[PDB]
Amino acid sequence: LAKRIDAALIMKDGRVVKGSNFENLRDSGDPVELGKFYSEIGIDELSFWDITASVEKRKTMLELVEKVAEQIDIPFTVGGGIHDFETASELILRGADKVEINTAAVENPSLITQIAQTFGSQAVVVYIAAKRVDGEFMVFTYSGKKNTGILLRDWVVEVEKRGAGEIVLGSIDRLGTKSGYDTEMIRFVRPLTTLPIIAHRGAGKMEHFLEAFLAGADAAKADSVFHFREIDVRELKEYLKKHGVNVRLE
C-alpha cells in the first residue's frame, strides 16, 4: 500500500486544543473545519482525541463524530477514554470509521476482540505508548503515568492475536521533541507484527517522515507541526514522492 500521512487533533468541549495558525479558516479552533481543510490539502486519515470532562464527554464525542462524518470523505478515528464496547459501538455507528483504545485495552485485551467481532479488525486501532526503562521497551498506560511492566515485544504480539487492525506506536522518549521519530523503536516492532504501524511522537521536519518510512512504518502521524504550520502537508508529500516514497498525490 501507499504510505499514509495522518493528522491528529486534540479536542475539548468541541474545540481544537491550542487551535491552529490557518488564517484562511473562519474558525481556526473548529475541529470540523480544520479536518475538512486537512482533507482538502492532502492528509490521508484524521484522528480525533477528546479530553472533555466526564459530564459532557459522551454526547460531545458523539456530536463531533456526526459532524465530521457529514463533512469529510477520508477515514477518521476517534478516541479518548473509550472504556467499553457499548461506547466504541455508538461512536462507530454514529460515523467514525475506527476507534482508538490504549489503557482500556491493556487492562482488558478482550475488548479488542469484542469490538472486532462486530465491526471488523479494521475498526480497532491500539495505541501503544512505549518508553525505554533499564534497556527494555516497556508499555505505559494512563497518559504515560504508569509503567505496566509489560514488554513492548509481548504486547504487540498480543494485540494482533486479539484482533486489532492497526497499531499506533507512540514513543514517550520523543514527547515534546523535534529530533525525529523513534526509528529504533519502529525497527524493533516491525518484525513482530503484520499489522500497519503508525509512527507517532518526535516529528519536526519533512526528512523525519522519510526516516520513519525507511524504518518500516506504514503511516506517520503528527499534530502541532501541522497545526502551527512548521510543515506544509503538500510540500511533505511532494518531498516524500521526490525521494522514492509511494504516497497518494493529487
Author numbering: 2 to 251
Paper lines:
Computational design of KE07 involved construction of a theozyme to catalyze the chemical reaction, which was then grafted into the scaffold of imidazole glycerol phosphate synthase (HisF) from Thermotoga maritima. Catalytically essential residues from the initial design include a base (Glu101) that facilitates C−H bond cleavage, an H-bond donor (Lys222) to stabilize the phenoxide intermediate, and a π-stacking residue (Trp50), which was designed to stabilize the transition state and favor substrate binding through interactions with the aromatic ring of the substrate. This initial KE07 design (Round 1; R1) catalyzes the cleavage of 5-nitrobenzisoxazole, with 103-fold rate acceleration over the noncatalyzed reaction and a turnover rate (kcat) of 0.018 s−1.
Thus, the mechanism by which the remote mutations that appear in R5 and R6 increase activity is qualitatively different. This is mirrored in their location within the protein; in contrast to the initial mutations that affect the active site directly, the mutations in R5 (Val12Met) and R6 (Lys146Thr) are remote from the active site. These results were consistent with the crystallography and kinetic analysis: whereas in R1 (original design), configuration A was the dominant substate that was sampled, by R5 we observe increased sampling of configurations B and C. By R7 and R7-2, configuration C (which was the only state we saw associated with product in the crystal structures) becomes the dominant substate sampled, with configurations A and B sampled only rarely.
